[PDB]
Amino acid sequence: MDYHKILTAGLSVQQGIVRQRVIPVYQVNNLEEICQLIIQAFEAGVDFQESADSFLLMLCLHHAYQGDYKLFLESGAVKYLEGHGFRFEVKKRDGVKRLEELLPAVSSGKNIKRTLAAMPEEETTEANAGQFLSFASLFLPKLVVGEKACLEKVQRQIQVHAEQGLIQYPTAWQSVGHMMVIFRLMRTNFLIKFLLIHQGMHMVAGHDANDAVISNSVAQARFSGLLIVKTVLDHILQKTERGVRLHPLARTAKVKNEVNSFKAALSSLAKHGEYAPFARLLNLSGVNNLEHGLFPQLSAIALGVATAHGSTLAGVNVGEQYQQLREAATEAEKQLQQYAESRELDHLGLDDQEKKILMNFHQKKNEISFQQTNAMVTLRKERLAKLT
Amino acid sequence: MDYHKILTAGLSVQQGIVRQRVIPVYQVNNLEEICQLIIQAFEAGVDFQESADSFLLMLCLHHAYQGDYKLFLESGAVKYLEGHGFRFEVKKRDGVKRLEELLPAVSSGKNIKRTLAAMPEEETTEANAGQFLSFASLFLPKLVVGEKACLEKVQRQIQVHAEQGLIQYPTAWQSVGHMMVIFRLMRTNFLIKFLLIHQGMHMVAGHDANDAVISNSVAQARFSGLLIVKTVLDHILQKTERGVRLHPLARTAKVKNEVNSFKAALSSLAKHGEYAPFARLLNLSGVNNLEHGLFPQLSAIALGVATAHGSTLAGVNVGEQYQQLREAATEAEKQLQQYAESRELDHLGLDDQEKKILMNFHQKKNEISFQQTNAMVTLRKERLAKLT
RNA sequence: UUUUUU
RNA sequence: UUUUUU
RNA sequence: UUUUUU
RNA sequence: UUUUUU
Numbered sequence: 126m127d128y129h130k131i132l133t134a135g136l137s138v139q140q141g142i143v144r145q146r147v148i149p150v151y152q153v154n155n156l157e158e159i160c161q162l163i164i165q166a167f168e169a170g171v172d173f174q175e176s177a178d179s180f181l182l183m184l185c186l187h188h189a190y191q192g193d194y195k196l197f198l199e200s201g202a203v204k205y206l207e208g209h210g211f212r213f214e215v216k217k218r219d220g221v222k223r224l225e226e227l228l229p230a231v232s233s234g235k236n237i238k239r240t241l242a243a244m245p246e247e248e249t250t251e252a253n254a255g256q257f258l259s260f261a262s263l264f265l266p267k268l269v270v271g272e273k274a275c276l277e278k279v280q281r282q283i284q285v286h287a288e289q290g291l292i293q294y295p296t297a298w299q300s301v302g303h304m305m306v307i308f309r310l311m312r313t314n315f316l317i318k319f320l321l322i323h324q325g326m327h328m329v330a331g332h333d334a335n336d337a338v339i340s341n342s343v344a345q346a347r348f349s350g351l352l353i354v355k356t357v358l359d360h361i362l363q364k365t366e367r368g369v370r371l372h373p374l375a376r377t378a379k380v381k382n383e384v385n386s387f388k389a390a391l392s393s394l395a396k397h398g399e400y401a402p403f404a405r406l407l408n409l410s411g412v413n414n415l416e417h418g419l420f421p422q423l424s425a426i427a428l429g430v431a432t433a434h435g436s437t438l439a440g441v442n443v444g445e446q447y448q449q450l451r452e453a454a455t456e457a458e459k460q461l462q463q464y465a466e467s468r469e470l471d472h473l474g475l476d477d478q479e480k481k482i483l484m485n486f487h488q489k490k491n492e493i494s495f496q497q498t499n500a501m502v503t504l505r506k507e508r509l510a511k512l513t
Numbered sequence: 514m515d516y517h518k519i520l521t522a523g524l525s526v527q528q529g530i531v532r533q534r535v536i537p538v539y540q541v542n543n544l545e546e547i548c549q550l551i552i553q554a555f556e557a558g559v560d561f562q563e564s565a566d567s568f569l570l571m572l573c574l575h576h577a578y579q580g581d582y583k584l585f586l587e588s589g590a591v592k593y594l595e596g597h598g599f600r601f602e603v604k605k606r607d608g609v610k611r612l613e614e615l616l617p618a619v620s621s622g623k624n625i626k627r628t629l630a631a632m633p634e635e636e637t638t639e640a641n642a643g644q645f646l647s648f649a650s651l652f653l654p655k656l657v658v659g660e661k662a663c664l665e666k667v668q669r670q671i672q673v674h675a676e677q678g679l680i681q682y683p684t685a686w687q688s689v690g691h692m693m694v695i696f697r698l699m700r701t702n703f704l705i706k707f708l709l710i711h712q713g714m715h716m717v718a719g720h721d722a723n724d725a726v727i728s729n730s731v732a733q734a735r736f737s738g739l740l741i742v743k744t745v746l747d748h749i750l751q752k753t754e755r756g757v758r759l760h761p762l763a764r765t766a767k768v769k770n771e772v773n774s775f776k777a778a779l780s781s782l783a784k785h786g787e788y789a790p791f792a793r794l795l796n797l798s799g800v801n802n803l804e805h806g807l808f809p810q811l812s813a814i815a816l817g818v819a820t821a822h823g824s825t826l827a828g829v830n831v832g833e834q835y836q837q838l839r840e841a842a843t844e845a846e847k848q849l850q851q852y853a854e855s856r857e858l859d860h861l862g863l864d865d866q867e868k869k870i871l872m873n874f875h876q877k878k879n880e881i882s883f884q885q886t887n888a889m890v891t892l893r894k895e896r897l898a899k900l901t
Numbered sequence: 902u903u904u905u906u907u
Numbered sequence: 908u909u910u911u912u913u
Numbered sequence: 914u915u916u917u918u919u
Numbered sequence: 920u921u922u923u924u925u
Contacts (some may be wrong), residue, residue, distance in 0.1 A: 127886045128746065128757070128776070128779060128783075129746065129752055130748070130783070131746075131779075131782070131783055131789050131790065132590065132743075132744070132790075133791060134786070134789060134790070135714060135735075135787050135788075135789075138714065138715060138787070139587060141715060143577070143712060143716050144577070144716070144719055145578050145579070145581055145584060146578070146579070146719075155816055207720070208545075209717060209718050209719045210719060211719065232545070232546075232870055233545060233641075266553060266919095267916090269914080269915050269916085270915055270916055271677070271915080271916085272678070273875065274915095285920065286920085288920080289921075291920095307677070308918050312679070313679075313722055315719060326922050335617065341920085345919070349915090350914095350915055350916085352915090352916080352917085373867075373871070374871075374874070376857075377854065378822075379822050382747070393871065405915080407718065408720050409717075409718055410716070410717050410718065410723055412915080413728065413729055413732040413733075414732070416913065416914080416915095417913080417914090417915085417916095418912065418913040419825075419913060421823075421825075421913090421914095423913085432917095435917090435918090436918095437917055437918045437919090438917055438918085439917075440916095440917040440918080441916060441917045442915095442917090443916080449881050450878065450881060453874060453877050453881075454874075456871075457870055457871075460870055460908090461867070461870065464864075464866060464867070501917085502917095503919085507684065561915065619905095649910080654913095655909095655910090657909050657910085658909055658910055658911080659910085661911080674914085676914080677914050677915075679914095701908085729914085733913070737909090738908095738909055738910085738913085740909090740910080768909095794908080804907065804908080804909095805904090805907080805908090805909085805910095806906065806907040807907060809906085809907090820911095823911090823912090824912095825911055825912045825913090826911055826912085827911075828911040828912080829910060829911045830909095830910050830911090831910080832910095836911095887910085
């Protein structure tokens with residue numbers, strides 16, 4: 126019989142229903158006034174402890190379908206979410222004007238009623254659902270990293286979308302605390318980011334400006350936090366027309382054990398399907414099976430072999446446990462790649478002048494790449510110096 | 514006939530029902546007020562001698578299903594527990610406000626009534642079931658070791674989850690005695706840790722923040738206390754594509770007898786199934802069959818061969834009965850691994866420059882690993898010096 | 902009459 | 908009785 | 914716990 | 920983010 130079954134026995138389980146969470150959907154006569162009240166409430170700086178979910182669902186409903194309940198509850202995303210415990214019920218309500226009247230009067234929301242009662246119900250702003258969903262969707266790249274990377278990326282991206290004149294934003298939405306509130310709201314919830322991802326990756330044509338911004342952010346926020354998967358699968362586990370061959374820097378025993386464990390975890394992620402490259406954003410099942418430190422030898426070698434080719438990967442930070450191995454790996458890969466290019470140039474049957482000009486071209490290209498990486502390493506050291 | 518049947522005759526028994534323990538489930542109109550009273554009661558610092566089980570069950574019921582009795586009593590975990598003597602009955606109760614009124618008035622709980630009667634029923638706190646279950650689930654890694662390792666690990670993990678801004682905890686829950694009370698409650702009971710493990714390993718998607726913390730702690734608390742299983746099955750009992758071969762440091766007679774006894778105990782554990790790597794936490798049947806001292810020769814040799822490869826296993830403590838054998842085993846494995854790597858590099862047909870750079874790379878990697886283990890051993894000696 | 906160690 | 912690192 | 918560039 | 924000429 127087999128004995129090694131116990132190690133990986135619990136990785137692959139069946140599929141059941143464990144949550145059973147029920148979400149209400151309000152069907153109100155007027156909708157745009159309520160959406161303006163919700164946007165004004167989030168601009169006021171308050172939070173909803175549990176009841177934010179129905180509000181964001183109704184806002185996304187107004188943006189997408191413009192008030193079509195029968196087609197919304199027969200969609201594909203709602204059909205997907207009912208296979209994981211979500212249950213959407215529908216409630217009706219007459220002409221209301223206040224979110225306290227719309228609130229289901231839960232005693233835990235006493236502080237919510239206290240904050241919304243102090244909110245002045247007289248001021249009006251100028252926005253809609255599309256601007257709010259685009260400005261929330263800008264946070265999706267680099268969301269796993271932290272606050273500072275998110276703020277730097279979104280302050281770059283607003284200026285990019287302001288130069289190419291698609292959409293302008295109000296200046297009150299560029300204060301720091303408002304961005305902090307939207308960052309916390311995007312980090313805690315689940316439903317809003319799944320709706321943004323599904324709507325961004327399942328449109329075909331007929332895009333608006335807000336849909337263009339959402340689809341651009343979804344396309345840029347791919348494989349965020351899974352750099353180990355790209356750096357292993359591109360170089361270390363190299364695909365040939367015959368089959369799959371290992372890199373010659375990975376032919377020991379311990380690294381081979383790491384490769385086998387990595388193949389098991391990769392199959393555990395590939396269970397999912399179309400939503401697999403977004404996993405760290407959606408925090409799926411087999412996400413915790415792939416971490417740094419659980420693959421100590423393979424990670425640094427894979428990152429060194431990857432940063433030997435590309436010149437932009439020198440800016441990534443690792444830690445004080447892998448750096449010297451990374452340096453040894455990238456130097457060995459540089460010299461092996463130089464020898465391989467020289468032998469491959471000597472392979473084909475050509476003239477001497479063609480070989481001379483190709484050697485000159487390869488030498489100049491290697492010099493340019495060396496200078497760019499030498500600049501990038503000093504820029505990373507300057508970043509870590511300016512951090513403290 | 515056979516004569517060796519008597520030694521292992523009692524290891525494998527049949528399956529019957531020996532306990533027959535009955536647990537009540539209270540069905541009350543209001544639930545969140547009672548959950549706040551229970552959390553305030555555990556913050557007060559009192560204990561429940563027998564009646565803690567129904568309280569924790571009702572709290573987990575409020576967190577998971579939000580008050581769905583009919584779907585809870587038809588779940589998978591409750592179906593599993595009825596095969597081992599647990600019997601859940603359901604009782605109803607009108608609008609109550611005090612845990613004395615909810616208590617079934619047992620004369621052994623006279624001290625419980627005395628402590629809860631002295632508890633002031635006026636103060637209110639700010640928490641819920643999810644924060645309490647996550648803060649209780651943080652104790653699951655390193656729970657078998659002792660108090661100090663638990664407190665150090667959870668004070669690390671709270672700061673980790675505070676940097677990556679998912680969840681903040683109240684500062685009153687970080688005093689020492691409160692953590693002691695929750696440690697004692699987690700060590701004595703059984704039902705709460707089984708519910709946490711099942712809910713953590715059977716979700717697929719749709720995680721909340723508290724569910725993310727619980728699933729992370731369940732994933733990190735795997736094979737806790739069964740290091741001998743990993744260190745034997747990874748190296749000593751090495752799997753080949755042909756079959757299973759023994760390590761050349763384990764080809765004597767006594768070690769072969771230890772291997773046969775280990776195979777018998779491994780089959781006794783593999784009887785269980787999906788809950789097998791969690792066994793020392795759940796304290797299952799064949800747990801006591803695998804102990805240190807019952808395998809005197811195999812344990813130290815296996816740990817030495819394991820710590821020859823990895824550089825973090827040098828920090829484990831053993832005792833004054835295995836240390837010199839561990840040292841001899843790890844030195845022999847270092848020199849055998851060096852000779853094997855040199856011969857394997859000399860195996861393949863390549864160029865001289867490639868062999869030169871691969872030898873240089875292997876030499877530098879071995880130097881880095883040697884320096885890291887030399888640091889880790891002195892750190893362990895410093896720990897044992899600072900212990901007394 | 903049994904005599905360790907876990 | 909368990910003793911690392913994630 | 915993740916750490917680049919688009 | 921695209922960057923010419925017709």
